[PDB]
Amino acid sequence: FNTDILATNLINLSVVLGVLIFFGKGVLSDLLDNRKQRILN
Amino acid sequence: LGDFMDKRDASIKEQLSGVKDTSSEVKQLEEQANAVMRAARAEISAALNKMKKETQ
């Protein structure tokens, strides 16, 4: 119910979510874009 | 979003089919034109021959 503040729970999660969003938008846009190009073809 | 994905894919697939459809239609048009041209020529030739033979 109340929020619990501490800088231990999430610093590990920010690095992970950043790495996943960057390398995931890279390989995901590459794959998705490739599929779109094939459909256009 | 699922519907949007489907719509875009269908729109593209439909475009390909239509493009495939148009190509077949043009092939048929060309074949029909070729066949028709042949008829004209051949037809007239035959006519003259039969007519030429009758005159002779």
From Swiss-Prot, chain A:
What residue intervals traverse the membrane?
Answer: 6-28
Which Cys pairs does UniProt list as disulfide-bonded? Answer: none
The beginning of the lineage is: Eukaryota, Viridiplantae, Streptophyta, Embryophyta, Tracheophyta
The principal location of this protein is: plastid
Q: How does it assemble?
A: F-type ATPases have 2 components, F(1) - the catalytic core - and F(0) - the membrane proton channel. F(1) has five subunits: alpha(3), beta(3), gamma(1), delta(1), epsilon(1). F(0) has four main subunits: a(1), b(1), b'(1) and c(10-14). The alpha and beta chains form an alternating ring which encloses part of the gamma chain. F(1) is attached to F(0) by a central stalk formed by the gamma and epsilon chains, while a peripheral stalk is formed by the delta, b and b' chains.
Q: Which UniProt keywords apply?
A: ATP synthesis, ATP-binding, CF(0), Chloroplast, Hydrogen ion transport, Ion transport, Membrane, Nucleotide-binding, Plastid, Thylakoid, Transmembrane, Transmembrane helix, Transport
Family according to the record? Belongs to the ATPase B chain family.
Q: Gene Ontology cellular component? A: chloroplast thylakoid membrane; proton-transporting ATP synthase complex
Would I find Cytoplasm among this entry's keywords? Answer: no
Record's protein name: ATP synthase subunit b, chloroplastic
In the UniProt entry for this protein, what further remark is given in the free-text comments? In plastids the F-type ATPase is also known as CF(1)CF(0).
Q: What does this protein do?
A: F(1)F(0) ATP synthase produces ATP from ADP in the presence of a proton or sodium gradient. F-type ATPases consist of two structural domains, F(1) containing the extramembraneous catalytic core and F(0) containing the membrane proton channel, linked together by a central stalk and a peripheral stalk. During catalysis, ATP synthesis in the catalytic domain of F(1) is coupled via a rotary mechanism of the central stalk subunits to proton translocation.
Please, which domain of life does this record's source organism belong to?
A: Eukaryota
Subcellular localization(s) per the UniProt record: Plastid, Chloroplast thylakoid membrane
Give the Gene Ontology MF terms in alphabetical order: ATP binding; proton-transporting ATP synthase activity, rotational mechanism
Swiss-Prot record, chain B:
Q: What is its main location?
A: plastid
Tell whether Ion transport is among the UniProt keywords. Answer: yes
Q: How does it assemble?
A: F-type ATPases have 2 components, F(1) - the catalytic core - and F(0) - the membrane proton channel. F(1) has five subunits: alpha(3), beta(3), gamma(1), delta(1), epsilon(1). F(0) has four main subunits: a(1), b(1), b'(1) and c(10-14). The alpha and beta chains form an alternating ring which encloses part of the gamma chain. F(1) is attached to F(0) by a central stalk formed by the gamma and epsilon chains, while a peripheral stalk is formed by the delta, b and b' chains.
Known role: F(1)F(0) ATP synthase produces ATP from ADP in the presence of a proton or sodium gradient. F-type ATPases consist of two structural domains, F(1) containing the extramembraneous catalytic core and F(0) containing the membrane proton channel, linked together by a central stalk and a peripheral stalk. During catalysis, ATP synthesis in the catalytic domain of F(1) is coupled via a rotary mechanism of the central stalk subunits to proton translocation.
Q: Where is the protein found, in the record's own terms?
A: Plastid, Chloroplast thylakoid membrane
- Recall the taxonomic lineage recorded for the source organism: Eukaryota, Viridiplantae, Streptophyta, Embryophyta, Tracheophyta
Spell out the protein name for this chain. Answer: ATP synthase subunit b', chloroplastic
**Species this protein is from:** Spinacia oleracea (Spinach)
Q: Which UniProt keywords apply?
A: ATP-binding, CF(0), Chloroplast, Hydrogen ion transport, Ion transport, Membrane, Nucleotide-binding, Plastid, Thylakoid, Transit peptide, Transmembrane, Transmembrane helix, Transport
Q: Please provide the Gene Ontology terms (biological process) for this protein.
A: proton motive force-driven ATP synthesis
Concerning its family, UniProt says: Belongs to the ATPase B chain family.
**Additional detail:** In plastids the F-type ATPase is also known as CF(1)CF(0).
List the molecular function annotations (GO) for this entry.
ATP binding; proton-transporting ATPase activity, rotational mechanism
Which Gene Ontology terms of cellular component type are present?
A: chloroplast thylakoid membrane; proton-transporting ATP synthase complex
